[PDB]
Design a protein around this ligand. Structure first.
Ligand SMILES: [Zn+2]
Ligand SMILES: [Zn+2]
Length: 58
């Protein structure tokens, strides 16, 4: 029996995470919009050279 693992009780550290899969990453791709996107995701949409395109999530 071991409790106390996850939670925001108290810790000096900030991190982000994808929006689609909601996975924890070290360096999330912050597109123009701002939302977080992982290579696995950001890629699914950024498949073509459609640089000019609105955020999918928004
Ligand atoms: Zn993702
Ligand atoms: Zn967005």
């Amino acid at each position: 029996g071991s409790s106390g693992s996850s939670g925001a009780l108290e810790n000096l550290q900030v991190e982000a995470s994808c929006s689609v899969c909601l996975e924890y990453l070290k360096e999330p791709v912050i597109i123009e919009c701002g939302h977080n996107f992982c290579k696995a995701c950001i890629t699914r949409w950024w498949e073509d050279l459609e640089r000019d395109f609105p955020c999918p999530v928004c």
